[PDB]
Structure formats: structure tokens, C-alpha cells
């Protein structure tokens, strides 16, 4: 019996819908759902989307607590709708995918993955549930995850980590590592041998290597010598330029740790969504130095290095291309006298 | 007078509403109110209630700056309205209890406690202003605190902490330690002699004990063989099993703070309001195990070990009615072979 | 060429309005400016002011990102409206001036600064942008500030500190001081020999000087014979009293630093605006001393015993003026027997 | 270049959004769009649909201006979405199909039928716009409305009257009949020889025949005897029974017509659209009688006689089948001794 | 002692803001100001403007309910302000000028007129007020309307209506007829010898003259013999040609009214104001016939044949320029062969 009261208590007592019976007092007011507490409103939800309040409430209760990719794989994959489940976006604070199946009738495009309009639709199917193994094998336009191994299928290993209750993790007690599949026209395609970003954060920068444990600790020069970067570099693309206004270079992520630990800086992120590459609004609270747009990409050093070694040095400005979280990523490199003098990630 | 432009002029100058006379433009636009400052529109206020903006402004504006008791003892002692002045429920963001008295007519069920329908109402009467002990005494249902002794009747101590603008705090230069009278139907109530709550944060995890200093510092084996913890299973109870994916025990605060220090997690508050009990949602960010809804209190770790070794070890199964901060909560002990196997709190 | 699209096309792109041509799907929906990004919306704003949600919009997108003065300053100078430029206040989230000059029709009270309307109206001129020191000069009423000199006018030094984009900074790889002019009804004026307010948060706190290093490591007496501050009372007027409940003195922000960093407390703005002089809401969690309004002044230590060397130190009670940041500042001055009792800032 | 003043602009001067170049100053403040016409601000549009304001907006001021058919035609023939047009829905004030083709990218599922999107959806193609027929032609799913008859399809008659700005007419100046044509799956079908709603209203009822005329001029049993209706219970079916509380019959909107005339009463449309057949919340203001649900249907009298005549008295009840405007809609015939007791459209 | 307690006492009893001290209760939920009467919250009004919702309850519950000038008069001659008294728009309904002067200081742009800001405004002064006459002599810029003769100054006679409470009227028991004076740069200027517009509406139009009552009985051919108007045109430019499918002519209400109570048909007015020219999206019910915008104005039309008399026929194309209601109107002359083709007034 779908309504909003059975919704709200389910909240109120396990903090997600959790399919139990039992209706409790609800007041929406302003985007805002309240319920009554031994006589007074505590504030159960409040729409951030753009989907109206009792349609988001519904969708949120129902979102998904198990670990589940990241929503930037998911879009790099072409998911278009998850199929039984509902995605949270925690950093959009709104569900990921605009239609569901099979969750609520007031959003379903279709009851069932097999409808003729969602043959045009690339699905998403979790392996874990049972039952969706044999959907993905027999849906058109698919990606499937698996914990293992599926039988007549070659996997491609995801990322390390994945997300759970919008806190992304590298997981012990649980597996945040999964296998994806992926059918186009009804034939299995093969994903690209692709690198990964690893979302990490300035705030909770923990290093994954031990390259990236001398890059923290050695200064500039120790840190160059003892890696061999003395034509790469690094000192604008990875360690940035504060000297004059428009504040130069960069561009991974681990020099913005670096240089925030000696003296932090703000971050403007004016498009607030998850992409494997980010665009932000970046000034220096010490120099006064600033950029307008400041592409930043998050990869391991260790696999940067590996990139940009596997570089033609001797050409001046040619336009990389690569694959990083199953998408091919626009790298511009340029060359000064055959020596690298920039590469900057394409806009 | 009663209007609004006195109301923003005391806030605009005071802070909050201390009774003087004057008049400020107000602008209000979607649940805020507005004062021009200079030729400038300054945010005075932002309504999170489900009251009108107007009269949830009025009652923030008047509300209580002297060190009052947190909203959740006088919830636990059956308070229905506070006579004369504004309690503020800062972990709510709106106002304690739904009417008043004597504080304004668009909200007062009553001008004065003596009204018939105030008569089965639980009233709670501060003995520090000059009036209300006597009120008190006249009154039908009623809580009444006062700073010392008040003659014909037998105190009850409270917390050592109270909340004084929603920071609560042991006090020095003020007293934050009442005494706790109560009388229904007419007749003074003996209150129970029940253990409290200390109310701390995680972010600001205070020991108040060397028990406490103890397990912050010493280890599961070192801190369990020091106290002879041996048959009570604080491994699980209070340092948590993160072994498994749902995470197991943790149900003080001071094991959350241990764990914290450790590795920091994050913890959702899903219903937020002040309960001597809260649910979390918590989710581990190391170990990636995570439990949908785990109750949580904060007693003195002393007192936690009192109250667990003042039990029967051999039943397997029983429930446990022990009183806090003026209720009874019922904890559910299990006994492995005679020794201490689990003791949550029940829900 | 003006529209909505366009704007939020720049937003999405550069971060604010840079003057591209091309247009992107824009929702409006609760004071909220989304976009559509790959099939999904993101809130591109959310407005704060009391301005219409697309007014305001253009306004922020338009806004300054050179380094400017700080709100405050322009307060103090009288500023009514500044000339081809919109000055964002982070402070209030909002515009600083409420018309424009050659920004937007929908908000230009004139074209130019040059109409009869704004003749009795102090506008800002820059002079960084080609063109605006000539129209200082043509203005009636008006204030320039410029890198370096201008023929023929005698200018005044501004604070070592800028805001480049909401964070106030001494800039290096920027010029964040600037030399500030002013005609009043076409005489241009001789700006006062004032002192300057530098700035400063109390989480992230900075001392500028080694008497500002020897107050947050020296103890109170011994910083206090050191720089021979006997009868200047800094046990009351920087230090702070917290015995009692009525929080005494306190009123420079490096005590409140010091106070803060062995005890951290909660400060409550109650008017979210710059002013040289602030008033705040405080209250002591450690001895649960607090104050309703507490003005706060910040100067550079050095600055402040300059003006207290500079009293008659004899008599009981007098109301001086100071000069800080262009503005006369009443401060309290209460001698006992001829030695300084408090010296609280007038209200 | 798609844009919002431009757009009013457009509506500004000609009502409409006719495709010139110019603009104009726009506020949108709660769902309403202002403008300002000499310094004071005009509202252009309120919002009554569910869609965000601006989008709402364009689609309004896009809508169609000539004679096009009444939306419940288009339900009745499925018609999913209309290409390179807005049909707006003046009952709703909303717009009657929810996407667009070549519209505005903020509602095209696609910029031209022929996209993969557009193949399963039954698209409106207006015949008087050049270029829509050869688009009917190709169109998987598609209906079409031509002036006059279009080479190698044969047509279909609609009804004499269609919408103009909302409302409802039989054109002299225009021509407001056209020819329904309709294709699935690539193959024209052959629309129904069916019966027409006549769309009339009861404040502005004008009889349409002689039939008519005589109905509302002549006694009841003047007009009974002289069409011979003796044994098919007009007195139920088209008078009503005000006698007991329940209304009784009254189905026909002449019915309704005739006893407004007399004594008028007041009808609630609790389900505000279009359709062939509608339910009202029915109160006699005379009698004081009253029913829940009276569906209420508004044929020719002539076209109704004709149906009831081609029915059989013989059976006691049948569920009758009647196709109007394109679809068939069931009919409760009670007939007893072969006179009828109940024609009643069936709910 | 302002407030809006008190505004909303005054509204409650009176009516309107006469300035009886009393205050009520009132809340505010979604610009709409409720007041609790007996038990039960009543709207006591409903925002419509850009205002914030109680600053235009104030401009409202204050606005002048004695016989006031139309706004259109106002707009005509320049008036920026009313001087003392506040102007409602019941046609926008919103107050009718943006700032004021003495009304109250959350939109008193000044306190009074002889300040700085004020000078170059037009005001309006009301001369039944005592000591407005006074005021306008010492005004720079300002209009003046007195009930009778001013000493020393030369007067315009005004339309015979004006507006009491948002109905036009010509007035009995009050005179509402003023005379209009007008001090531009401090020299009295000379008003235009204009003709008036008479402010009717189709749905109550009451003849004003014997050739008006000639119009709407005589048929057209009679009329137009009767009054001579042969190689005039009437039959387009007064009567309407609703034969082709753009609707024709029907540039003047009476017009409208004769077409509206043959065939009544529907007017839209896209810019809900005053003014003297106003256009309409008009389409014809009977039959069929349509235009996008229409010009109306509403003379007399005795006064419409005199300024048509008043014209050389011979020019085929010419400009008129035509004063009506203080402003020049520029109407657009076709004639064919010499004789009266098309009057339309020009857009």
C-alpha cells in the first residue's frame, strides 16, 4: 500500500525505507516534510531538487545503502536509469537518474526494464540483488556490476573504491571493488584497459603510495631528483605557479593538498556534481593569486607519471587522448625545445 | 506596546528582546526577516519553524539567555508550557513547547498558569524569578527549579550542566545546578533517584572521570584487565565489532570518541531533536560497515560500569528498566553461559 | 546581446560573467538559478538578497574579482554606488550598492555617471580600468583609488589589505593597496591621518607584529611589565574578566584569540554585515560567563597602545574620537585616581 | 537566439511570441513574471502549471493562435505530442503535452520527429503549415488535420467548431473544420464513423436545431408527445428528478440548460479538463437536492434521440457502446418492459 | 507609534488606516496577512506587488479613498510622487508610485518635499488638503490639483469623472472635478487644450450624448446618413469588419460595445494598467475573426467626429497629432481618392 505516511515512519524508525507497516502525522510546508515527535515538528527531509517535495521525500527514503559506484562511473558508463534501485547523488543532493523502474509509479517511466520505451534506455543492473543477472543478459542497452564472476562473460575490475551513504571508501568488511559488464544493441561490449581517479579530498588527503608519500614530505628538488623529473614539469603542472596573478599549473590534485597544508586557500566549485574531472575557481589566500577556471583531475602520481612518460616528447603541441574512468579524457600537451613545457587537461 | 519594529529594534541593538522602546524598518520575504542597516537590507532572522515568520520571530527574539535546563529533562519530566518565558530549542531551531503563557497573544492558550485551561497542563515555573516559587505552590500540575532550598519541600539535584544559549556547559561563574520539584494533581511528586546523561559532542569529546582517561589512553586489553571487565564484553558493548559488514555494539558515546580519534567516521542524525537515547545512521569510513539505526547514550563511563556490574549475569534474555535523567529506559541484556554477552538499549 | 542564457552559459563555463556569446537551458524554481548539465540539473545559484531571483543572478555573475576595497571602507567614505562595476559583499551575500551605473538596465538608476540623478551621489571610480580616473575627475561627487599616482591630486594610503574574491588578503603576486582620492562637491578632500582596522577571524588568527607574538605566548603579567602596561588595565580591556557572570571587557579581537585557543566558545552574530566596529553575543563555555552585546574593534596591538600611550590618563571620564578607517569611532575612556579604569568602545 | 526578454518583448508588444528581435526588463518573483512599463512593474503571467516558471513562460507565449482542435479530439486520438507547435490547454492553463519538437531545448525530447525518441510517440502534424503533410507521411505514429483534402488519403470530417484562443466556435471568418488522418506503425488507419460533443456551456447555451428550440420553449409534455419519446424516459434521462435528495438522471447538458433557466443551481468541476463525458458535484438550489457524481455528456438531442432509438428495449440491461469524438464510450442502458428505465454513461 | 498590529486594528474596524491606537493579532503566510477573529484566522489582505508583503499592507491600508485622479492623468503629467498620501492602482493593484513622501520611512525616499533628493521629481499635491497649495507654490517641479481657484494661478479643467475607491465616476454628492496646475523647473507651465478620454467598459457602457444613443440603435447606414459622416468610414474604423479572418478596424469602445451586445466575444488585456490607449488581443466569437494587437481608445464620439472633421482629407498618408488627456496621441491617416480611408491610432 504505497502512500507517505508509511513512508515517514519507516524513516523515522530505521532511517530509510525498509518496507515496514505503520502510518505516522507528516506536515509539508515549504519543501520541507515535518512529523509530529511527543508534540512537536522535527524536520524529516527538505527538497533540494527540483522534483516535487513528496516525490523527492520518496525517492530519497528509498535510495540505495549498500556500496554502489560512484555516479561519475555511472555516467561515464551511459547509465541512464537504474533499474529496482534508486541512486542518490549525495553531492547534488538529488537522485541521480530522472526516471526509475520499478520503484514508484509516480516516476516510472516503466514498470519493468523490457517496456518498448526503455529499449533506447542504457540500464543499470546490480548483481548483488537476485534476479538481475539473467535482466542484464536479456535487457539491450545494459551495465551490469557483479560481486565475481558471471559465467560467459570477460569482466573489467572497477575502481577500488566505491560509495557508500555518500561517503566513498575502500572497503574491508564490505566489497567495494565490481566487475562491469556492459551490452549495447544486445552485444557485449569490451571497456577499455582505463585508469582511475581516486576521490580524494583536501580536507582528508591521505596519500595512496609511497611516491606520493615523498611528494608530501621531500620539498620540490628532493622529490624531482629522486623520481627523474627533471624535463617534465612538475614544478608548474603538479606544484603551480604563485608568483604572478593568474596563479599557473595546478592540475592534480596533490599539489593542491600541498600546497594547502602550508597555507590553505579556498575552492570554488560552481558546478556542483561529480566529473572525473573538476573545474574550480582557485585563489591563494597568501601570494593573491588567482584563475578564473582551473581544471583538476584526480589521479594516482604514481599513474600520472606513468602518462606523461608515455609521452612523445619531441613534438611541441599535440592533444593526448586518455581513458581514465571508462571515458577518454583530453589531455593538451606541450613541449618546449623537446623538453615538456605544460599539460594542462582540455576544456 | 506589542508590535514587530520594537521587536527587530531590541534585536538589532540588543541581541535579543529586553523590553525597550523604539522603531526599525522590517522587510519580510519568504520566512526572513529583513532590517535596513545604513540603506542596506540585513538578515535579522530565518524561520525554520512551521510557525508564521512574524510570531516564531517573536518567540525567538524573547526567548531565555539565563542558564536553562536542556529541553530533554523537561521533556522526561512531563513539561507542557513554560509560565512567562520562552524556552529555545537550539537542536530544533524552534521553540520548546507549543504555547505560552503570559508571553504573547498570538500564541498564549492562557494569559495567566490559574486559567481552567491551564489547570491539566504540566507548567514549569523558574524559582529564579522573583514570583513564580509561589506559583508554583498554587498550581495544579507544575515543574518548579530553584537555585537553593525553598522551605516545606524536598529537592531533587540535576544535572551538573545546563544549556545556556544552546551551548550547554558546567558552570563557574554561574550556577548550572537545580533542584528539581514537581508535583501533579495538586500533590508534590517524589522524584526518583536516577543517574543523567553528561551530553557531549564527539568534535569536543571531554573526559569527566580517570576511568575515562583511562580508556581514551590505554587500549581494549590494558583498560579491560585494569577495570576487571572481563566477563562484560565492552569489546563488543563499547569499542564496537567492525569486523563484519553491519557494525556491531557501540552504543556509548565514549566508544564513538575512541573510534573517532582512530579513524573519523560520520554519524546522521535523521531525527534531530535532544532525547536522553539518540538513533544514528552510522557508517564506518575505514573498515566500510555501517548499521541502519544504532542507538546511542552518553552516561558517565563510571556509571555505566556501575550500572552493568548492578545486574544479574546468569538469565539469558531480560529487560532492564534503569532511570535516567528522570525516565525509565529499558536495556536488554543477553548472558552467554552465565556472562555478559550484549546489553543494547532497546527500541 | 543581454539575457538569462547567456549568463548562466558564462557561469557554467568561467565561473562568472566574462562576456561570451552562446546560451544553455536555465529553470528557475525558489529563489534558485539550475541548469541542465548531461541530462541532470544543477543549482548554478541561490539567492540570498531581497533583489528577484534573476536580478540578483546578473548581479553576481557580474560581480568584481580584482582585488577591491573592503565593504567597510567604501561605508566609510560614503560610497553610494560604484561606476561600471558590481561590488559583491560576502559578508551579506548580497550586492553592496543597490543601483548600478552602466551595468543593467533593470537595475542602472543611470547609464552614466554623468546624469542629473546622479549628481548628489558619491560614486566609486577605479582606477585600474582605463577611463575611470578622467571621470573621477568630472564628477561631482565621487571616490577613486589607484595603483599608483595620479597628477595633481594628493592621495591617502589604503590597508596593507584587499578582498580578491571574498577572502581579504596582503597581496604579493597582487597590489592590494591602493591610494584613495574623494571630491565632495567637486573639492576634492584631504582624507584623514586615520588608523586602519586589520581584518582579521578569530579561528584563523595571525599576529602582524612581535608585540602581537609575545601576547599570544607570553602569560598575562609578564607581556604586561614587558611593553610597561601597569596602569593601562589590559586585565579588563583586552584580557578579558570571566569570574563573573556579566562577561567584562574583551573587546580586541587578539584576547579573544588568546581566550579562544585555550578555551574555544561560540560567537553569535547577530547583524551578518562589515563594520569596523562589531558587536557580538558571547558566552564563555568554559566558566559560563557571557555578555548580550559585546563591541569588538580589531587593531594592530602596536596601534591600539599607541592610541592608549596617547590619553590624558587623568581624568575620570571622557569620550574620545579615533580615527580608524576613515571614520571617527567614539571610544570610552573611565580613569580611577588617574589610572586607566576600562576603555570601551562607545555605542 | 533563444532568450527570456526577447520574450517578453515579444509579449510585451504583440501578445504573443512572434519571432522579433528586441528586449525588455523582467522580474520573476513567486511563480509571476513582471515587467516594467514606465517605471512601475506590469505581471505579463502567473504559473498554474507544475513546470518552472520561465519554461512555463516561453511555452505560453509560443502557443498557437489559429483555430486548432479541442484537446480532448487530440486525447481521443492518442496524440502524444504536437511538432513545431504548442497547444495550449486554456481549461488547465497549462500546456497540453508535456514535451516539445522544435520548440525550445528546454522541452525537446527532440529537435525533429524523425529521431530514434520520437519513433513510439503519436505526433500532431498541422496540415495548414507548410511542410507537416510529407512529415505526417513519413511519421511511424503520427495524426494529421488538413484544410481540404490531401492527394492519395481519404479523410475523416471533424467537428464544425475548434478552439481559438481558447475558445470554442463554428468559423465563418475561418475555417474551424478539418480532416483527421492517422497512421500506426506506418499504416493509415480508418477512423470510426463516429458521433461529436457539441462543447457548449449552460451560462451561454444556444440551441443548435429545432429539436433544440423546442425542448427548451415547450412544456415537458409538449415536446415528449410531439417527438414521440413515450417509452424512453427523457422525464429521468434529460429532465431529472428533483423530487427526492439523490438528483436523479439529468446526463445531458440540455437538461442542465433548461433547469438553470428556471432556477439556476451550481456545478463543480472537481477534475478541471477537457473531456467527452464529465462529472460534476451537482446541487439543486430550489429543491436542495444533490448527487456526488452526475456524469454529464453534451451530444445533439438529435444525435442522442438517434442513438437511443437504435437501441433495444427488449433487454433489461445491456452495456451500450457509442463511438464519440473518436472513442467509444459505454452507456448504461436499464430498460425494463421495454421501457427504459436509465440511459446513464457508464463511470 | 508605528507598527502593523496597529495598521491591521485599523484595517479590521475601519476598514482602512484612519490611525486608531489598538493592536491585533496577525500572521503571515505566503504574502497574504491573516488576522485571528474570534477563534479563526480571516486574509486580511493578499499581496500582488513587488513589495515585500508588509510594506505594501502599510502602502495599501494608507492609500486615499477621497476622489482621486485616475492613474493614467497622473502618468500623463509627469507625476513621479505623491506628496503626503498614497495612490492605489486598483488596475494593476499595486501602489501607483514607487517611493513616497511622509507615508512611512521604509519607503520614504524623503520625509519631506523641500529636500535635495526630491527636487528633481515631479510631486503631485492635493489642494483639499491644507497646506499642499503652499507647498506646490515652493515645489521646483510638481502638479497641482485644487477643488476650486488658486490666487494667482491660471487653471486647466479635468475630466468630469475621477476614481473613488477604484470606480470611475462622475460625482453628485462629491465633485470630482479638479483643476490642473503644473510647475515644471519652477515656472508655471500652460496646459494643452486636450480632449478626454471617458473611462467606460464594455460590460456596463452607458451612453454620454444623443449620437452615442443615435449608435447603438440606429443601424449603421442610418447613423451614417443621419450625421453625414459619408467619405469617413465608419464602417471599418468604428464598426469593425469582422468578415475576413484579421479582424478589422474597431479602434473605439463604443464600437466594442455595439459588436459586444450583438455577439458577445472575449478581450484580453496582456498589460493589465491605465492608460489612455490601451491594446488588446481581441477575437470574435461569431465569426471567427481575430487580431493579435488592437488599439482601443474611448473618446466621446462627438469628440471623435470632431477631430475627424478636424482633418484634411486630401493627404493620402499623414501623422496626426492629437492631445488627449494631457499627452499627444499620434493617430495615422490613409485616405483613397481623397476621401477617409483608415484612422488607426499608431503604435
Given at each position: 500500500a504505497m502512500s507517505l505516511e508509511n513512508v515517514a515512519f519507516n524513516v523515522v524508525n530505521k532511517?530509510?525505507?525498509?518496507?515496514?507497516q505503520g502510518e505516522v502525522p507528516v506536515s509539508i510546508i515549504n519543501n520541507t516534510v515535518y512529523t509530529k515527535v511527543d508534540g512537536v515538528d522535527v524536520e524529516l527531509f527538505e527538497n533540494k531538487?527540483?522534483?516535487p517535495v513528496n516525490v523527492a521525500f520518496e525517492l530519497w527514503a528509498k535510495?540505495?545503502?549498500?556500496p554502489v559506484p560512484e555516479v561519475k562511473i555511472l555516467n561515464n558508463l551511459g547509465v541512464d536509469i537504474a533499474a529496482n534501485t534508486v541512486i542518490w547523488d549525495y553531492k547534488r543532493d538529488?537522485?541521480?537518474?530522472?526516471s526509475t523502474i520499478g520503484v514508484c509509479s509516480m516516476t516510472?517511466?516503466?514498470?519493468?526494464?523490457?517496456?518498448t520505451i526503455c529499449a533506447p534506455l542504457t540500464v543499470f543492473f546490480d548483481g548483488?540483488?537476485?534476479?538481475?543477472v539473467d535482466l542484464f543478459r536479456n535487457a539491450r542497452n545494459g551495465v551490469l556490476i557483479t560481486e565475481g564472476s558471471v559465467k560467459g562473460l570477460q569482466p573489467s575490475v572497477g575502481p577500488k573504491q566505491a560509495s557508500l551513504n555518500g561517503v566513498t571508501l575502500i572497503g574491508e568488511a564490505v566489497k567495494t571493488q565490481f566487475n562491469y559488464y556492459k551490452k549495447v544493441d544486445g552485444v557485449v561490449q569490451q571497456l577499455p584497459e582505463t585508469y582511475f581517479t581516486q576521490s580524494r579530498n583536501l580536507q582528508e588527503f591521505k596519500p595512496r603510495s609511497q611516491m606520493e608519500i615523498d611528494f608530501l614530505e621531500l620539498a620540490m628538488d628532493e622529490f624531482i631528483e629522486r623520481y627523474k623529473?627533471?624535463?617534465?614539469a612538475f614544478e608548474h603542472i603538479?606544484?603551480?605557479?604563485?608568483?604572478?596573478?593568474?596563479?599557473?599549473?595546478?592540475?592534480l590534485l596533490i599539489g593542491l593538498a600541498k600546497r594547502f597544508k602550508e597555507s590553505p586557500f579556498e575552492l570554488e566549485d560552481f558546478i556542483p556534481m561529480d566529473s572525473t574531472v573538476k573545474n574550480y575557481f582557485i585563489t591563494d589566500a597568501q601570494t593573491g593569486s588567482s584563475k578564473c577556471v582551473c581544471s583538476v583531475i584526480d589521479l594516482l602520481l604514481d599513474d600520472f607519471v606513468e602518462i606523461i612518460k608515455s609521452?612523445?616528447?619531441?613534438?611541441v603541441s599535440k592533444v593526448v587522448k586518455v581513458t581514465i574512468d571508462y571515458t577518454e579524457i583530453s589531455f593538451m600537451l606541450w613541449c618546449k625545445d623537446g623538453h615538456v613545457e605544460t599539460f594542462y587537461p582540455k576544456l
Open positions: 532511517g530509510h525505507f525498509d518496507g515496514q531538487t527540483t522534483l535510495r540505495n545503502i549498500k538529488a537522485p541521480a537518474h530522472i516510472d517511466i516503466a514498470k519493468k526494464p523490457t517496456e548483488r540483488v537476485d534476479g538481475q623529473l627533471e624535463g617534465y603538479v606544484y603551480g605557479d604563485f608568483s604572478h596573478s593568474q596563479l599557473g599549473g595546478l592540475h609521452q612523445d616528447l619531441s613534438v
